[PDB]
Amino acid sequence: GLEEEFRKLTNVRIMKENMRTGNLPANMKKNRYIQIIPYDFNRVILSMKGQEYTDYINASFIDGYRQKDYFIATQGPLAHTVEDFWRMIWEWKSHTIVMLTEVQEREQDKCYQYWPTEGSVTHGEITIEIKNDTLSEAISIRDFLVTLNQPQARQEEQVRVVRQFHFHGWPDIGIPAEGKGMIDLIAAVQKQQQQTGNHPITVHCSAGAGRTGTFIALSNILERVKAEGLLDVFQAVKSLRLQRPHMVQTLEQYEFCYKVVQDFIDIFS
């Protein structure tokens, strides 16, 4: 049963023995939450330039159904990590960002706005220029021109398009009342990834655990249902809980996973 499954998920141990880098004093200011920190065995490592601790961001590579390291699960950037966030996007060649929160929800700040609503913004050596913004139901799809400005000699060849899927269909309290929004989000993300190929999909909410884990679990589960027909939810979520603390954080989110799968089967007929 669903509550017994989630009880076993809760019991998945947080493996603190492997959380050294994120717990270093100089890196702790880069975390939103003390208890959501990546494991060293899959943390996303950035280049270093001086700089002893500039290789850290609170972000984990997460396995997909067919491919290792298919997702990056990360927290919403902070004001003092926005440069690291865009450097991660560049250095690991992510072309797709999935945002599962508003920047502000119920008075509280959930995510620094790291993209330009209009025009351009520069964070560190990287310039981001919004080229298109399309709203379709509860999903804003935004295409940005992203330029690495260093070295100046290579500026012309160092331009990429990065697409952000901004999901507006998650209530400030509880879980979505329908699965269609989540199913459409996953399907649009899948269409984009056909064109880019084996590039990691960057996914974030606020801490990068609850909604983020739900989106990733459902992407993985629905792919397995399509390829094998195997109906499992527990093992897919358990695997995520072993890759990053608290992926799929609450019972209601776990319920939502089952509901979305059922809605997907119904569309599947």
CA distance, first residue to last residue: 25 Å
Strand content: 15-25%
Supply the CATH class: Alpha Beta
Number of helices: 8
Inertia-based shape: globular
How many discrete structural domains? 1
The class by helix and strand makeup works out as alpha/beta
Computed Rg: 18 Å
**CATH fold type:** Protein-Tyrosine Phosphatase, Chain A
Q: How many beta strands in the DSSP annotation?
A: 11
Percent range for helical residues?
25-40%
- Tell me the name of the CATH homologous superfamily: Protein tyrosine phosphatase superfamily
- What is the CATH architecture descriptor? Alpha-Beta Complex
PDB class: hydrolase
Keywords: phosphatase, hydrolase
Assembly: monomeric
Entry title: Crystal structure of PTP epsilon D2 domain (A455N/V457Y/E597D)
Provide a descriptive summary of the structure in words.
The chain has helices at 2-10, 20-23, 25-28, 82-91, 180-196, 210-228, 234-241, 251-268, and strands at 43-45, 56-62, 71-74, 96-99, 104-105, 108-109, 120-123, 126-136, 139-148, 159-167, 201-204. It is globular. It has a 9-stranded mixed beta sheet, sandwiched between helices. It has a two-stranded antiparallel ribbon with strand order 5-6. It is α/β, with parallel strands linked by helices and 269 residues long. It has 8 helices and 11 strands. 33% of the residues lie in helices and 22% in strands. The longest helix has 19 residues, at 210-228. It comes from Homo sapiens (Human).
